Write a protein that binds this ligand. Structure first.
Ligand SMILES: Cc1ncsc1C(=O)N1CCNC(=O)C1
Ligand SMILES: Cc1ncsc1C(=O)N1CCNC(=O)C1
Lengths: 269, 268
């Protein structure tokens, strides 16, 4: 991988692995999400961020602050097959005091065509108190160093799916998968549950017949609260709709505390 | 990746990923096991095996046969850190009518030193009846085309750890993790639970304090029966001792054994 000529974005190629594919012999959405996270991490290292798994700036370390995901939105047109080379371009942008955004474009390395796109919103959090906060002036000035100054969006459109409000699923759910627990392979190097695991848990309550007959086209996931290593999760899904749409909810199995909410759009194979 | 000059082994380089590492910022044993499986699949594709996830020969397809894992043994001296390049060399060998073996050597790409080694035993199974079989004359002939004819072993030593008999853990277990279930990311392209998932489930019953203070040096795992997509597993562990453990994976309900194994850990 490497930064582009202007030093304002980063590109990396990946060869899709045997264990990274599903029944259709193409990359799962979890493999796509792991690759987005990997290229994001390589971009951060290349522009001088912390090499400790937290990707913080100098001002962030002085104030004991970290970036936490608020939303992930992924749209896939073609999933790369086992053995194909996918090229992913990524860049960051500051959104005033709200937070920051990381965007991605996925391409077929051979044809050069765009096969997918993604966007993620990140918010500032104090590492100690776990309280969300606004982005300060000094942090906004550090982002100018490596971010394009004219707006560059993976999802530019006037009314795009990436910015839609997601409602809270009402009981009873149409489908459910209960008692989901993370194992050590679900944790990152800092022992927090990997953001990609929440995607897999959301999808666990989609009926197998939908997965067997449809391709996942869009997924939008809101991150409300973290699942801990010793927490147990319930994944709930209700149909909201040639195209199938679902509303999703992840909550703690005990008290029912919400951890994530989201939506998926599937098209017939 | 590519076959070596003699066409009897295969080499591939991997850059260790951010999500592939543990708290020590080095590759987990599950990442090592996934990389062994990946280079194994690339080797099979390059020597003309089926490209459907089963890696069968032409006589295996006519007889409706597939290879199933009987044992996996991995010994790691140094786990590669996040961003390091690891080089893995793999080859196969026929063991008469018993089955076949796939062996691996892991090296630090920069220094050229051996940082680990692995060996796996595979047995023939009829895909329809699920009955184990011996390897027939015709499939032993096909293995001669891409396997070294003089013995090449990752664990050559007589009476080594990779060939030891593993006992069955007796209740009560000292430690346990119950109610483990596979999700879709645990399945392979043919919807069977990935062999690497069983390694993770074995390790789930090791106390966190052992993981925090020790490095895993050796793991030997026997595969007895497959966990299905709708099965629930209990992982049991008892200390037998350097720290050594005896492990058992069994179905949550009736207690049917699926795997048994051992691990050896060294103080950090
Ligand atoms: C530079 C940056 N700005 C907003 S997100 C982000 C980033 O690259 N990451 C990936 C690693 N860990 C994180 O928490 C965030
Ligand atoms: C060629 C060969 N011979 C014994 S094991 C093996 C092998 O490469 N694999 C990896 C893919 N799927 C399998 O079932 C076994």
């Amino acid at each position: 991988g490497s930064l582009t000529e202007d030093g304002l974005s980063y590109k990396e190629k990946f060869v899709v692995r045997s264990y990274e594919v599903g029944s259709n012999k193409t990359a799962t959405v979890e493999t796509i999400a792991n690759l987005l996270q990997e290229v994001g991490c390589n971009h951060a290292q290349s522009v001088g961020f912390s090499t400790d798994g937290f990707a913080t700036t100098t001002t962030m370390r002085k104030l004991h602050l970290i970036w936490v995901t608020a939303r992930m939105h992924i749209e896939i047109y073609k999933y790369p097959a086992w053995g194909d080379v996918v090229e992913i371009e990524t860049w960051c942008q500051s959104e005033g005091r709200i937070g920051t955004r990381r965007d991605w474009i996925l391409k077929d390395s051979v044809t050069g065509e765009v096969t997918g796109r993604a966007t993620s919103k990140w918010v500032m959090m104090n590492q100690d108190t776990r309280r969300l906060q606004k982005v300060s002036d000094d942090v906004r000035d550090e982002y100018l160093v490596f971010c394009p100054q004219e707006p560059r969006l993976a999802f530019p459109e006037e009314n795009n799916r990436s910015l839609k409000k997601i409602p809270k699923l009402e009981d009873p759910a149409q489908y459910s998968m209960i008692g989901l627990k993370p194992r050590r392979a679900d944790l990152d190097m800092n022992q927090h549950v990997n953001n990609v695991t929440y995607i897999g848990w959301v999808l666990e309550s989609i009926p197998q017949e939908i997965v067997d007959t449809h391709e996942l086209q869009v997924i939008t996931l809101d991150y409300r609260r973290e699942c801990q290593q010793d927490d147990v999760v319930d994944s709930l899904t209700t149909t909201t709709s040639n195209d199938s749409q679902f509303l999703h909810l992840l909550r703690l199995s005990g008290d029912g505390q919400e951890i994530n909410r989201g939506t998926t759009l599937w098209r017939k194979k």
